[PDB]
UniProtKB/Swiss-Prot annotation:
Belongs to the staphylococcal/streptococcal toxin family. This is Toxic shock syndrome toxin-1. It comes from the Bacteria. The chain holds residues 41 to 234 of 234 of the full protein. Responsible for the symptoms of toxic shock syndrome. The gene is tst. One of its GO terms (cellular component) is extracellular region. GO terms for molecular function: toxin activity.
C-alpha cells in the first residue's frame, strides 16, 4: 500500500501534458498570462514564482509544454478555455533534435530507458523537464506504483557545474521555479529511485 501523497503524485505525473506551439500572447499580468492558441482556444496560465515571471508582451509568439490544473471549459462566448500552470517559453528551435542524457538507477541498479523522446526546442522550463523525467519514471520504472518506489531525486548538471534538482517524494516546487534553461548546455541528468 502507498500513502495518499504518493497517490496524488501518481495521478499527477501519469497523466499527460498539454502542448501548443506558436501561440500568441493576449495579456500578461503579475502571476499569469492569457494566450491564444492556433486552434482557437484560450489558455489561462498561472506563474507563482518570482524567479520565473514571463515578460512576453501582447502579440509575441510562445510555446506551451504545460500541465492542466483543471478541466477545460466551454464559455458563454463560445470560447474554449484551458487552465494550466507554468511551461511557457520562446519559439526558438535547435538545428537538429537532440537526445537528453538521462541515466536512471532503481535501488542502486541501472535501469534502461524506453521511449525517452528527443527535443527540438532551444529552451524548456524546469517544470517541463520535471514532468518529462517523472513521466518516464512512472510509466517505465514503476515510480509511485508500489511502496518500494516512492522517493529519490533527479539532478541536472549544466556545463558550468551549476545544478538543479528535485525531490521525487514531493510535488515539484512551482512557487520557487527558476527560469527556463538552454537544453544544449545540459551536461548530465541523473535520476535515482530509492
Amino acid at each position: 500500500s502507498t500513502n495518499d501523497n504518493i497517490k496524488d503524485l501518481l495521478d499527477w505525473y501519469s497523466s499527460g501534458s498539454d502542448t501548443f506551439t506558436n501561440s500568441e500572447v493576449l495579456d500578461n499580468s503579475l502571476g499569469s498570462m492569457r494566450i491564444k492558441n492556433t486552434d482557437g482556444s484560450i489558455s489561462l496560465i498561472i506563474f507563482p514564482s518570482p524567479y520565473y515571471s514571463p515578460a512576453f508582451t501582447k502579440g509575441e509568439k510562445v510555446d506551451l509544454n504545460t500541465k492542466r490544473t483543471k478541466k477545460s471549459q466551454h464559455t458563454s462566448e463560445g470560447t474554449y478555455i484551458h487552465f494550466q500552470i507554468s511551461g511557457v517559453t520562446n519559439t526558438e528551435k535547435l538545428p537538429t533534435p537532440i537526445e537528453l542524457p538521462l541515466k536512471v538507477k532503481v535501488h542502486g541498479k541501472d535501469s534502461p530507458l524506453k521511449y525517452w523522446p528527443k527535443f527540438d526546442k532551444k529552451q524548456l522550463a524546469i517544470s517541463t523537464l520535471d514532468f518529462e523525467i517523472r513521466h518516464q519514471l512512472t510509466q517505465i520504472h514503476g515510480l509511485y506504483r508500489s511502496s518500494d518506489k516512492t522517493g529519490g531525486y533527479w539532478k541536472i548538471t549544466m556545463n558550468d557545474g551549476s545544478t538543479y534538482q528535485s525531490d521525487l517524494s514531493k510535488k515539484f516546487e512551482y512557487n520557487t521555479e527558476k527560469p527556463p534553461i538552454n537544453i544544449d548546455e545540459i551536461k548530465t541528468i541523473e535520476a535515482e529511485i530509492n
